[PDB]
Design a protein around this nucleic acid. Structure first.
Ligand SMILES: [K+]
Ligand SMILES: [K+]
Ligand SMILES: [K+]
Ligand SMILES: [K+]
Ligand SMILES: [K+]
Ligand SMILES: [K+]
Ligand SMILES: [K+]
Ligand SMILES: [K+]
Ligand SMILES: [K+]
Ligand SMILES: [Mg+2]
Ligand SMILES: [Mg+2]
Ligand SMILES: [Mg+2]
Ligand SMILES: [Mg+2]
Ligand SMILES: [Mg+2]
Ligand SMILES: [Mg+2]
Ligand SMILES: [Mg+2]
Ligand SMILES: [Mg+2]
Ligand SMILES: [Mg+2]
Ligand SMILES: [Mg+2]
Ligand SMILES: [Mg+2]
Ligand SMILES: [Mg+2]
Ligand SMILES: [Mg+2]
Ligand SMILES: [Mg+2]
Ligand SMILES: [Mg+2]
Ligand SMILES: [Mg+2]
Ligand SMILES: [Mg+2]
Ligand SMILES: [Mg+2]
Ligand SMILES: [Mg+2]
Ligand SMILES: [Mg+2]
Ligand SMILES: [Mg+2]
Ligand SMILES: [Mg+2]
Ligand SMILES: [Mg+2]
Ligand SMILES: [Mg+2]
Ligand SMILES: [Mg+2]
Ligand SMILES: [Mg+2]
Ligand SMILES: [Mg+2]
Ligand SMILES: [Mg+2]
Ligand SMILES: [Mg+2]
Ligand SMILES: [Mg+2]
Ligand SMILES: [Mg+2]
Ligand SMILES: [Mg+2]
Ligand SMILES: [Mg+2]
Ligand SMILES: [Mg+2]
Ligand SMILES: [Mg+2]
Ligand SMILES: [Mg+2]
Ligand SMILES: [Mg+2]
Ligand SMILES: [Mg+2]
Ligand SMILES: [Mg+2]
Ligand code: NA
Ligand code: NA
Ligand code: NA
Ligand code: NA
Ligand code: NA
Lengths: 209, 141, 64, 114
RNA sequence: UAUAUCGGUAGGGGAGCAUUCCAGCGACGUAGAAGGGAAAAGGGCGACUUUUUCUGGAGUUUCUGGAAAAGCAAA
RNA sequence: UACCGAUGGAGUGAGGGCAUGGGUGCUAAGGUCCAUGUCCGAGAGGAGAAGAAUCCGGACCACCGGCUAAGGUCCCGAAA
RNA sequence: ACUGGAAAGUAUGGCCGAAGAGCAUGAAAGCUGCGUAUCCGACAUAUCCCUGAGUAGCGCGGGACACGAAUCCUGUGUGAAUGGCGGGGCCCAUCCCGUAAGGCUAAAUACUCCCGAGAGACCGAUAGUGAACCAGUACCGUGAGGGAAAGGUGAAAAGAACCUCGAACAGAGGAGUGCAAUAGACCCUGAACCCGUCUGCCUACAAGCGGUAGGAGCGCCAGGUGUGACUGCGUGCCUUUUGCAUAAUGAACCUACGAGUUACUGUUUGUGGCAAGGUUAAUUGUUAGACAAGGAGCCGAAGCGAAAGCGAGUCUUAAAAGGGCGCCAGUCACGAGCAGUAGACGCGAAACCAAGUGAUCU
RNA sequence: GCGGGGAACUGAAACAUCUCAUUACCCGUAGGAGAAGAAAACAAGUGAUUCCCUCAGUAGUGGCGAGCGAACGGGGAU
RNA sequence: UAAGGGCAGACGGUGGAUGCCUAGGCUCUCGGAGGCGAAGAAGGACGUGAUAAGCUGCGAAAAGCUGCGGGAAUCGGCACA
């Protein structure tokens, strides 16, 4: 596809970039997007949860009552789950929730998300910019000029740009990401996607086909 | 779709079976186990190769044969795939485009019908006759 | 843990090309003057595992 | 996470116990006793929905028998005559006429009195 | 659209409801949240769900997907 | 109208009554062991006063409609 | 400005942002407080010719090695060589490799009583540690040892001056405080079982699981609601059984608690990605889980034969298709079912073994 | 961590070889780690130890039962 | 005529469920550190406050003594003085 380029003042610059068709104009795979999103949210998990089973309780293993003759239910030791304060049966155990997805499946899901953004027309290509000093107001003005300051936005940068990151840190509906670390969840989680020219070049080079 | 309207493919996810949770489910009470006996108890396990005390088949039958340690087994390659690789050269034995540092034996199932010099660890007599008839050569090394 | 093969089964059974189990007939080791020559040759030949004994032989060979 | 459905579990019992009001003693409010009583009642209700049709037909037949004997016939003779003449008025309507519209019942009887 | 079929134990198969928490999207709340009492209505059917009012005095919830310490009448 | 191949999941491997053909027993047993059907098991409804398998009959739900089965029609109790 | 007891709420209108983390504040605060981003800061005191002899080897009895008698070890008895000597799964010869009977050695590895800083699709007072509080306390036992229950007034004690009944706050009725005292000290909410009072209807000629289906009269508030004269039908439930109203088992009742879970490895299947190929593991780089690398390995791609081996053939045979087996789309995942190994659906023995405590009874 | 002693219930659908297990337990004794470590080695070319992924439930072992179970090689950390 | 009883509603009693709440647990991550003791340890006994000490701290100098650095208006530990 072809996208016009805006400066940081919100005005069309007359320059145009070409987005790779094999990235931005493919038929999206909804099942692939589902799988990639699920894997991302599973990898974020820290499954630190546990309860005490019978072998891990603190009571002694002594038979509480004699087997026959007392006239009540037969009883073993005090750690039984039938007793109040007894064992937790089949409670949680520490777990690792990561699983495997094929690399080609992940690439397909990434391209499906990008194609979906392009088809629904939320991709804005902007000129590369730098800040001499960190300043939240300047980044806010850039977002307002690009008309992305209402809903969630994701800016994609070609490199670190520490001053820009510091400027965008405090804004609540703004996310930043490097071009080479683009993933399906992050692309889909934001309403608007903003790319720079160098970011477009990097994405086209690195995620094609 | 976005994160708010995710949908798996139809029939991709299925709910698990949960037993011992009431009459309406069809899986409560005895919870699919039947009534009594060994198989109804917690911790029952099947003894593999056990038939109730009758001498099992894996003891009734006799042991046979032996396995050679230094068995030289070749990977078979046929004339049909030789000709397929030839039709996009005349000098085979590249074979990485397969194997991975293996011994290759050329066998005769299809037909070469070309003029190729093939290097391989082994050939069959039929394969040699076929390649020479089509006008080829062998390098058995 | 991974499944363990039964040692006796791995010494007594073998896989054929189309996923059949090869076995040897078992009545011929030490009482052979009394038996019949055709009987002995039919016990010499290599047989296959019956379908009802399959999946039990497979469980012994770790479903391989 | 830990899940205990306290409110739903209690609400199920409360909904059923609203249905056992009016029962005698512990059968109205004690829950295991009350729930036991309510299900046996449901089996009774299924059976009695079937029995109600037989009961009402028997009542209609008895009223028709009395009115026919007042007119000079018996129930079996009257119904045979009606069926022979092809009159399709059912026993519910005939009993209603016998109880409340004796002139109409009389004209019906006079139609087949031949 | 028709025809046929629809008693069920062991048992096999299918489709759903509620519960706790999470992500995304929407919402509600001192002009009264959750919980507790009473009343009314609803559902091919049901698990259950809405609404009104009193008490209560601070949190709760819809839809889509995800994960389980995910449902008691007898031991 | 659902019989075979191959595959995934089973449960069952304490049966019982009746009729028929028999063994055993005493041509006893609501006895016991086989065979052929059937029903209860796992089956509600109707008659038989009340009865697991005798006689009639296989319950998707509702109906204050109708016809019948076995068996009945003096009253309890529907119909001479 | 509005509501409110009280704004941090809602509606306006402003400002800061390298600070929109959080906690507290009379309800939910970027701009009220402590903080947060960022920058600055230490008088000390700490930290950074020779070549290994009771040997090598050997007998007997044993042990450890994956191995239940090669290599290694030795209780008992013996016992060399100095180019020589040892090993290559038992012994011999050749070949190859090494040089015992002396010693030291960082890293990559294992762990958490303790300290600092963090986190959770972990619990939330019968849960989570036995222990949120008086906790290894109370209590029990000669002793070793066993081992609990127990959180919540209110924003703020403003924790009720004073009056009345009464011997007394024993308790209550007031007044007053407070948004609220039916928040009054056992104090948020305040369910069930269980216990009462009032009002409506029924009930002292009546006989069985207590309901269910009909159905007057009476009583409340406009077709609803309470009761129920009288009539038909009806031997609870669970479990175990050929078969249970059974005089077979089981439960006083209520609330709360209580039982197919997870990991790994297989197998089948639903749905997917790539496809004659499919897939990475451990690990590494960048920035900080993501992205990229990493092809070792595994499966498929040719079978037959015990095997040498031959190959769309092959085995059997002197030879014959006479006979057997074969020729004539996979792989990696996600979800689910099932299996095995783990305590493996839960509760329950009589016992066995190890280390201790007891002769204050007898 | 190293060392000295060392069970049984259990599995084998009985049980004695075997298993449970060189586990529980008792005892002795270090350090921030300890042990190991520089070939009288593996193999049929590599080149000290240690740890991870494979090789592989393979070779073997076994009342050849139940079971037990390597190494060479290759890829890494160092 | 209801001695008493039955059912329903309302309102109370008991009891402490439920909802909401909590730094008290549980599982981990990263970085340190990995001992104390004859210069007398761990763990205790008895003391110590203006007023009895249940905890806490401390040791006949006994909820504390001295110096240096930091800080700037309250402080005299907790169990509603
Ligand atoms: K049951
Ligand atoms: K036997
Ligand atoms: K909640
Ligand atoms: K029989
Ligand atoms: K209050
Ligand atoms: K409050
Ligand atoms: K109350
Ligand atoms: K009644
Ligand atoms: K008894
Ligand atoms: Mg014990
Ligand atoms: Mg517990
Ligand atoms: Mg569970
Ligand atoms: Mg069933
Ligand atoms: Mg069974
Ligand atoms: Mg049972
Ligand atoms: Mg049985
Ligand atoms: Mg058990
Ligand atoms: Mg009828
Ligand atoms: Mg039917
Ligand atoms: Mg059915
Ligand atoms: Mg209100
Ligand atoms: Mg549960
Ligand atoms: Mg319950
Ligand atoms: Mg049997
Ligand atoms: Mg039998
Ligand atoms: Mg009999
Ligand atoms: Mg049965
Ligand atoms: Mg039947
Ligand atoms: Mg008729
Ligand atoms: Mg009559
Ligand atoms: Mg603030
Ligand atoms: Mg507790
Ligand atoms: Mg007094
Ligand atoms: Mg109140
Ligand atoms: Mg209260
Ligand atoms: Mg009388
Ligand atoms: Mg009377
Ligand atoms: Mg019996
Ligand atoms: Mg009966
Ligand atoms: Mg019994
Ligand atoms: Mg009893
Ligand atoms: Mg009973
Ligand atoms: Mg009960
Ligand atoms: Mg109970
Ligand atoms: Mg045994
Ligand atoms: Mg009364
Ligand atoms: Mg009450
Ligand atoms: Mg002194
Ligand atoms: Na099902
Ligand atoms: Na409040
Ligand atoms: Na007072
Ligand atoms: Na009892
Ligand atoms: Na009374």
């Amino acid at each position: 596809m072809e996208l016009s380029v805006y400066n940081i003042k919100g005005e069309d610059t007359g320059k145009k970039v070409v987005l790779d068709d094999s990235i931005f104009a493919i038929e999206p795979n909804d099942h692939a997007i589902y799988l990639d999103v699920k894997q991302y949210m599973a990898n974020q998990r820290q499954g630190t949860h546990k309860a005490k089973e019978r072998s891990e309780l603190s009571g002694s293993t002594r038979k509480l009552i004699r087997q026959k003759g007392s006239g009540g239910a037969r009883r073993g030791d005090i750690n039984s789950p039938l007793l109040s304060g007894g064992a937790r049966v089949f409670g949680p155990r520490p777990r690792n929730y990561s699983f495997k997805l094929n690399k080609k499946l992940k690439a397909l899901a990434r391209r499906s998300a990008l194609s979906y953004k392009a088809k629904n027309n939320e991709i804005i290509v902007v000129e590369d910019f730098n800040f001499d000093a960190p300043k939240t107001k300047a980044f806010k003005a850039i977002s307002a000029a690009l008309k992305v300051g209402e809903k969630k936005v994701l800016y994609v940068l070609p490199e670190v740009n520490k001053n820009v990151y510091l400027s965008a840190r405090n804004l609540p509906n703004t996310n930043l990401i490097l071009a080479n670390l683009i993933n399906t969840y992050t692309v889909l989680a934001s309403k608007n996607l903003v790319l720079t020219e160098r970011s477009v070049a990097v994405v086209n080079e690195l995620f094609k086909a | 779709m976005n994160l708010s309207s995710l949908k798996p493919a139809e029939g991709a996810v299925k709910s698990r079976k949960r037993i011992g949770r009431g009459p309406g489910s069809g899986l409560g009470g005895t919870s699919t186990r039947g009534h009594k006996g060994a198989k109804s108890r917690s911790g029952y396990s099947k003894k593999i190769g056990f038939e109730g005390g009758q001498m099992p088949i894996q003891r009734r039958l006799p042991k046979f044969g032996f396995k050679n340690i230094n068995r030289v087994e070749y990977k078979p390659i046929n004339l049909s795939v030789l000709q397929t690789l030839s039709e996009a050269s005349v000098e085979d034995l590249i074979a990485a485009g397969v194997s991975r540092n293996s011994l290759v034996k050329i066998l005769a199932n299809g037909t070469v019908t070309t003029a190729l010099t093939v290097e391989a660890h082994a050939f069959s007599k039929t394969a040699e006759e076929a390649i020479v008839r089509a006008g080829g050569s062998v390098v058995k090394l | 843990p991974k499944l363990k093969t039964n040692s006796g089964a791995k010494k007594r059974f073998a896989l054929t090309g189309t996923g059949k189990i090869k076995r040897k007939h078992a009545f011929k080791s030490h009482i052979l003057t009394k038996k019949t020559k055709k009987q002995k040759r039919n016990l010499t030949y290599f047989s296959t595992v019956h379908k009802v004994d399959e999946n039990a032989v497979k469980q012994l060979l770790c479903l391989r | 996470p830990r899940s205990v459905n306290h409110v739903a579990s209690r609400a199920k019992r409360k909904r059923i116990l609203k249905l056992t009001r009016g029962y005698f003693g512990a059968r109205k409010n004690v829950w295991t006793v009350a729930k036991n009583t309510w299900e046996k009642g449901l089996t009774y209700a299924y059976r009695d929905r079937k029995s109600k049709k037989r009961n009402f037909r028997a009542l209609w037949i008895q009223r028709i028998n009395a009115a026919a004997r007042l007119e000079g016939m018996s129930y079996s003779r009257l119904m045979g005559a009606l069926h022979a003449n092809g009159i399709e008025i059912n026993r519910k309507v005939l009993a209603d006429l016998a109880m409340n519209h004796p002139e109409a019942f009389r004209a019906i009887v006079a139609k087949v009195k031949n």
